[PDB]
Amino acid sequence: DWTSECDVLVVGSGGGALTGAYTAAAQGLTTIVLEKTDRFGGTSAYSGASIWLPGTQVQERAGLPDSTENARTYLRALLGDAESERQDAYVETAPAVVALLEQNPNIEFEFRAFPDYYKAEGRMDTGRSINPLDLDPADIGDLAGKVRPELDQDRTGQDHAPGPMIGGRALIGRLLAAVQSTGKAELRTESVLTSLIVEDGRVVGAEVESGGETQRIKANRGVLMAAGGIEGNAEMREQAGTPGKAIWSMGPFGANTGDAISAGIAVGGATALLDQAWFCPGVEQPDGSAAFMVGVRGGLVVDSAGERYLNESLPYDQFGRAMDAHDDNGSAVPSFMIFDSREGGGLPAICIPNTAPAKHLEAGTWVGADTLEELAAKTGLPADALRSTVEKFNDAAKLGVDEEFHRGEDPYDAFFCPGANAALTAIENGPFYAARIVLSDLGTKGGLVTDVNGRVLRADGSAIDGLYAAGNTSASLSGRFYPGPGVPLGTAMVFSYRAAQDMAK
Amino acid sequence: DWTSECDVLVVGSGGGALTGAYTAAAQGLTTIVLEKTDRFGGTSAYSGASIWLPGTQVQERAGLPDSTENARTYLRALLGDAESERQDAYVETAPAVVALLEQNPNIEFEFRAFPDYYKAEGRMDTGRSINPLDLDPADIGDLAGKVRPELDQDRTGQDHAPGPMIGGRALIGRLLAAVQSTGKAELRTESVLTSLIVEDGRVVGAEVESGGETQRIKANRGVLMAAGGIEGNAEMREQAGTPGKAIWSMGPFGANTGDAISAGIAVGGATALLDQAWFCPGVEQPDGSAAFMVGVRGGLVVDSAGERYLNESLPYDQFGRAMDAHDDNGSAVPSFMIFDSREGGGLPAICIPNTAPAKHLEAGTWVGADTLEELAAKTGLPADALRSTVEKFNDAAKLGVDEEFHRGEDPYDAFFCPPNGGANAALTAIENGPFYAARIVLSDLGTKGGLVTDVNGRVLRADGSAIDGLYAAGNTSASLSGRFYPGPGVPLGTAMVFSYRAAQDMAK
Amino acid sequence: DWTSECDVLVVGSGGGALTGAYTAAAQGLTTIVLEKTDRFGGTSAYSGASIWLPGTQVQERAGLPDSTENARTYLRALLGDAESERQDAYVETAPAVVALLEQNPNIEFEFRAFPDYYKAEGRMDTGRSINPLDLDPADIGDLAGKVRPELDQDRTGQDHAPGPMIGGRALIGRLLAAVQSTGKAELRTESVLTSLIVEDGRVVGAEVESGGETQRIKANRGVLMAAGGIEGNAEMREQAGTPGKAIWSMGPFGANTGDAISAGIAVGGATALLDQAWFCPGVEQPDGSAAFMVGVRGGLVVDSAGERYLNESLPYDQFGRAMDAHDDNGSAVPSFMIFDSREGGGLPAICIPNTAPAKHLEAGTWVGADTLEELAAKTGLPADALRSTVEKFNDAAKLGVDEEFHRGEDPYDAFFCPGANAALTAIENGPFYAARIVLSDLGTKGGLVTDVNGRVLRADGSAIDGLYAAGNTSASLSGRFYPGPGVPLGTAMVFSYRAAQDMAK
Amino acid sequence: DWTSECDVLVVGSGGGALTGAYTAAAQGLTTIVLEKTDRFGGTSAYSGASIWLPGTQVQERAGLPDSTENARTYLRALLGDAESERQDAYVETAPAVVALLEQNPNIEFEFRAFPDYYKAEGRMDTGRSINPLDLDPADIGDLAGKVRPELDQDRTGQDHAPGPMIGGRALIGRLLAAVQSTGKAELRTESVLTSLIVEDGRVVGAEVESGGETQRIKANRGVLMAAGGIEGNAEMREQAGTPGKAIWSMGPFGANTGDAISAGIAVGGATALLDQAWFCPGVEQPDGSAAFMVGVRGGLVVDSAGERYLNESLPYDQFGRAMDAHDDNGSAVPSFMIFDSREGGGLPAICIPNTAPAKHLEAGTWVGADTLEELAAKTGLPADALRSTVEKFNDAAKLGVDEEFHRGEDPYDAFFCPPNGGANAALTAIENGPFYAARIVLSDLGTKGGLVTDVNGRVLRADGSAIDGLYAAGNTSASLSGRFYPGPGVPLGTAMVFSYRAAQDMAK
């Protein structure tokens, strides 16, 4: 009947999942971690591993003037009372999560400056998020080769490049080492959750595919599903009304297809926010995929009418949401980023992965021209509107003020730029370029409804015993907002920890 | 006649070239740097930026027990008296080069452990080489985007990945910022030396292609040619008898085609060591290129007879030279690296660039099999020999001693191995299938033959006389190291010292 | 005539002096540093090496929300307009000093939390001061053995203990290595300034004793005198009306006897603030010296009448100034710190150097008793007043409020303490102890009048050509205030730098 | 009858004792720790807290190429088959001890480079030992003040200096916090074991003095005696034939007077190796005591005949043993360390505690002179021999080779030497006067002879049988290392492994 048995079954291997697994395994509960693909970490591995866990011992070490209450105030100011109990659990539990994790020899974080994303009471203009320290891959042995590589390697048929493991690779490599060190955890790759097993109304285990064979794994205390969102599943996204496209998602291709959300729905779990994502502008690639565009430091962006319609320096989720709001049957998706040869043909932003300009020009995702009139012809933009847009923006750059969209009036805008306003630079030294910008995502954020301890709830608010969800398998407490750097990982980690604690009671 | 004029004309933009440029420009000499391609740095940018500049203030700050004389002793012990004057200039000048460079706010180095490569008096088992600190690209402005990206990006149609600039990218980014900061230097890309201009027997400038137009650039004090070797030029390699192949070279494809060496020969420069390179084993790629294989930590290697013939843990140049020495009509090039599934299908070494196993297996550069007999059939190796080779190696791993090739009896062999191995961290049994065989070819990190030079980088004629106004350093010059790669950073260290000395000579 | 020549002659080898020397030597000026004793560093070597240099790249790395203007506002709020130009130069120049120093491979700093000392607009409750990184003594070669050792070694006939060089020893060891690295500087020990040499009204060099021989050293650009204060000169202190005593000073015994201040007076330099010091409470030692008492976390303090008279948690300079104000009798100098056995007999504060309780008890600097009545008899304190004082304090601890002196109503009070108020802890588990507390100092702060570039001024405000002063050789811009951690070193370093820059013009 | 009762009674509070206590208390056994003095930690607190626990998770996290088997090979190569079972238990159990301890939130270690002490198969030239992380005293509350301070404070009437707790202070502070955190342990100071209580041939408890009153404490599972060696007991040392002197021992004055070893003998425990110690050269102090001399980086050493007789750069135990071997009725004890004014009068080594040169000169433990002839007169050395010895050594320094004692031919010798020496960083000419001679005596870091034990720490009788209920570890026990100090951290590492194993045995 049962192929194996454990106390805590964890589905997925991102930051949340591994934090849940660690929490369970470190207090003596036998734990099995199931990863679908041949690598641990998912999108978490791709990430910069900024983590929004405020008011902890990490920020105390840095002498940061902030607190749990200040962070609570910020969330409340942005999110309102919707999900206030989960907002409270999120900020209140951050210190304990960080304390537990840093008690492991394989884990250490530090504060790294990066501004919160909205002007509101409680905002930190320099940020409050933390990051794992760089990791020498030699220091975790055979685990390094099981961590998913960064986007710049993973989508070009490559494994890790020669430096240290940084960002998400450090996060996942350190979490894995921690989980392994407990001696209470079994880490499996190529093991796919297919359905949950329910007895007398309680989730008691799961059915799983690996090795072509199907298995049944018993979970005495519970199942934590932290297996990502629906971002890779075009059908679910289209049914939910999610903007963007699977092909533009920055999740690992084919990994996060909503399997855990579906398995949860099948046993009665309610869902929410399925039309929402962690949005970002994406630089369209030759193969139809996208690259995360972050840290804009020049150029401007136009809709298909050749006009500016947003502050290009906006945090990525707000940028993406403005694309979607402006879009009318494709007038803003794609949009076009217009820039000159100031950076030798390079686009003035950080693009992940970072495809050379020559490949884009060869494929036609970018076009270049000696004049704006010619650029307009090649892109389908109106020449007069485009010329007029650029002249107006260049006047704004001269004055150092953008009266139309107020670019360069916020610490986030200034943060990425080294004239009168560092964020406003004239577009004037040809050749000129236009890059297609699409509506990408860093995962979706809709999913199973959960309570403050990660328990999956039915439509009436009752808890499905034995079943927990966190990360993008769960509907985010953040609703339509991306409050600052590290919220996706921070929420994932806090609720995975709380789920494991609940299972331990 | 002249399109522009400067005091010091530098051809190339690797570590050496930029160090020469900095040295000239920082003491007031107007300098022009010509880079052939659209990015600065060449192979130097690809490098790990380990630099063998011993006995300097950098190693003092690490409390390293070493000195100029200890380093001199090591070179002498390996190289003998051949080029002893240039050996002396190399070690004696290192401290002044480092001191000059670290004076610049854009440049700082630190010691990083990595062992010297030969057992000899003066060897540092932990190393003595230094590296530039990681560099936030934001700290050098628009120069970051002009630095050539790492191999793992540059050969897949990509620009820099998101972290800091490290290794060669930090080296070149910092050097460029230093050169720019002088206010005496002009840095040019897509500018190609075609020939040297000689008046009354003196090199007085150069002819250069850029923008489809040809230019003539006057050099009042001299021309420093640090434009790399012949690695990318199959013809020059074949004429010279150089082993390996241009496509297997780890230099940037098409950059280093021996142009400066040819230009030097054309004005009377003598050459030497043209059959020599900085060799390394390369993991054959699906497209016929190679990947630098360094830091071997498992597996074994066989020739086409299914037998071991070298210590697989040898420093890369010695490994390469052993392939070439063993090779008889292709019996050792390619060789086959045999490994098991201990690392989940990964090859137990550092491969640059790091192509995923699945691509290799799809292309057939690697083959996998559940047994050795089958692995032998898929590679052409004799099954009995292969099986026997692996059993014997596995016995050696059990005992912790390799009596046949003495692998794991040297700090270099140990340095790259992970913990919790056996008796000998370099000897790990090949026993948990599936088993794999990867083709290994004779790659290079540049060639090291070229124009004959003196202690101040001046290009010499066959009779030993100096061609006035003409200097060479880096792989445009014949290396003082001859047939030896003494330790980490010798190619960059020699390039940097002699570029500095050339610029100092021009300043007299 | 002249024994040697240099561009810049620096007298002293504390943080200021070496920073001045570095600034000169790093831009090509030949520099000679003269240290009186056989070790470099003076009191600076003894220090914790907290440095109040606000709004620099160091605090930017830590994401600290502060700025030059915020720091300027704080000084102005405390100090008023007296010395406003020098207040401006101090805060405005801090970034450049830090930038120059961190450009040297031997120097790096980091922010370390430690609150500013007064409630006022611009205060950083977590601080804004910075510290040199720990230094492995092996990394600076033979220089390590030329750095003065910490107080816990230096006053017991010892050289450096085995760990890294930290605090002032790291500051001085890194500054020395930086100065040496320039190849433009000569570092001399056992070389004592005796008088300045003036030609045509310009200071052109100095007369110096070393090796029993007197020398004359020519200074082409100038002489920087950063040779400490008058703290070790009982006569100068008495003449000036400086409270405390030379033996109680935490300066190195006999080093800082006001030599440079006298030499300056002798060529026409005006002086100011000579009755002022950087004050601190000191734990009286068996040999009549003192130990810096900092980070009070328990106990209470009484005058000779057995009554509390100050907030015992005050920053040290305010504590010291309150002792002096209350002491119109020897009634407050000594005072008595009353504590119980909560810390096993240890005094609840940090004492530098840290003499064992058993030595104090043996010498009678401390007394112990099973009751307060007996403690009073052994100390001379009135028993009833003492008992009553402790009971009242204990009631305050119970309520969590000290109505009499408002202890525990400030971030500085809280910072050092791990009931209702962490700073108020009942004194109730015997045996009970009384330790004598005297009015110590961390150097005096009166001296030669100087301008924004460190030039020594005459009584009419005119500058004595060729002559500069900084650190405690100079009258501090801070007047009667110690604004926060690192002001003594920060002012010393900024004005030494500015002096060297002025000499370079 | 019984004053109190516990499952496991631990005598002593050094690293071993507290590790035993933790092991017992963390798995639910009630534990009482008895410390004789008013501070916890003993010599362990004084130590650098290097710990030789190879092949554990700690060295894995540093990527160190080493293993259990490599370590086993090293011990076997030095020690031979004598105590091979205990050698095996030591290396095999290290990982589990580390794992258990690092599971506690108060404990974390890291690898720190420091070479193993002998040239032999399995030596790590960089070392394999680990150290506790620096500890903020605020993180363990009232326990910090109960930890014995470092030597540089403890022997001058001082408590902890102002930095973090490091070395032994960190080790003991973290262990204490871990023990306390179990909620199963009672930590007592000023509680002195006087004798063991035996019923029907089983040790069932102990008699203990504290508060002037005598107590009887029942131990249901057993008594672990980890109360140090005989180092502080001149009578026991003289009876055993131990070289050195109590007054020169680096143990805390009066703490380790062999009380547990005597108590064990009294109930039938056999003893071994009582004439052995963990030896070191000691710089003789004004008060007749000594200071650990480690990390020699200059000077030379002579016997009373003014001649060199050993490699001065030898690891401390080998240095000490060479003094003892050469000594003939005081010809080598004291020896004289001869040095010049290169370091301003400082002795070229690390001395713990670090008494200023002026105090030595004032007391006459050191003498200074402008010439070697005079230095000789003041020390009782022959002038000609001394002069000749120094001239010969200076020639060796010039050549960079010491043909007589081969100093500077080993990674340990090099490890402590600053840069920019000459040919050999360990050999520096003695030539810039004044010249100094410092008296060097035969100090110790504890003795290593004591009660015979098995792989689980059980005290054995002369016939090899185990005394039920009785365990010993650390220097209360005879060391498995015999006459050898294999590398850094062996005294603490053995103490900790056998204390853990004893507690595990008691838990069965």
Ligand SMILES: [Cl-]
């Ligand atoms: Cl983020």
Ligand SMILES: [Cl-]
């Ligand atoms: Cl190299």
Ligand SMILES: [Cl-]
């Ligand atoms: Cl301060």
Ligand SMILES: [Cl-]
């Ligand atoms: Cl040791």
Ligand code: NA
């Ligand atoms: Na790539």
Ligand code: NA
């Ligand atoms: Na001391």
